[PDB]
């Protein structure tokens, strides 16, 4: 008895500029009729060195809809480069899309975002300081940490 079961996620923001917006073509199946708005949020771990930095790129609200399996296309402008530390910026990070209905999260696509330089030289030998402008977000679609939960979409 869930109202939305997100199934597929065709990430478009595969390794592209860090200043390119997170593009998630999610295909979810609205299993039931909805009452409130569906809150898909993209949470970019602001520091994989400190998780409490988790930033929020955007949150799309899909209102009450009478079920239906279909795809929508997420995009969200990049995080604050100042929020990310060295080891995270030129490193591995996660950007999770927690679908949050009624303030209750019922799924989490923890897409590992591997931030590695765009320019081959910089991949050859990563500059000691993180260049978010040279940074390319490789959204590891080979490693989607999908953690979904069951929530009360109702008031029971």
């Amino acid at each position: 008895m869930a109202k939305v079961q997100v199934n597929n996620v065709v990430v478009l923001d595969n390794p592209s500029p860090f200043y390119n917006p997170f593009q998630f073509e999610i295909t979810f199946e609205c299993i039931e009729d909805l009452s409130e708005d569906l809150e898909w949020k993209i949470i970019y771990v602001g520091s994989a060195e400190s998780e409490e930095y988790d930033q929020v790129l955007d949150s799309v609200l899909v209102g009450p809809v009478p079920a239906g399996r279909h795809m929508f296309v997420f995009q969200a402008d990049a995080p604050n480069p100042g929020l990310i530390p060295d080891a995270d910026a030129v490193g591995v990070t996660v950007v999770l899309i927690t679908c949050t209905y009624r303030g209750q999260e019922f799924i989490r696509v923890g897409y590992y975002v591997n931030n590695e330089y765009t320019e081959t030289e910089l991949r050859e030998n990563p500059p000691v300081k993180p260049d978010f402008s040279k940074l390319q977000r490789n959204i590891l679609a080979s490693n989607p940490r999908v953690t979904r939960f069951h929530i009360n979409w109702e008031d029971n």
């Binding site: 060195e49 080891a87 923890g110």
Partner: peptide, 18 residues
């Protein structure tokens, strides 16, 4: 320090965001 980036992220995904 936080060298284990993976596990940091694993935290947030497993149930740390919420």
């Amino acid at each position: 320090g936080a060298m284990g980036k993976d596990i940091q992220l694993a935290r947030r995904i497993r149930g740390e965001r919420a």
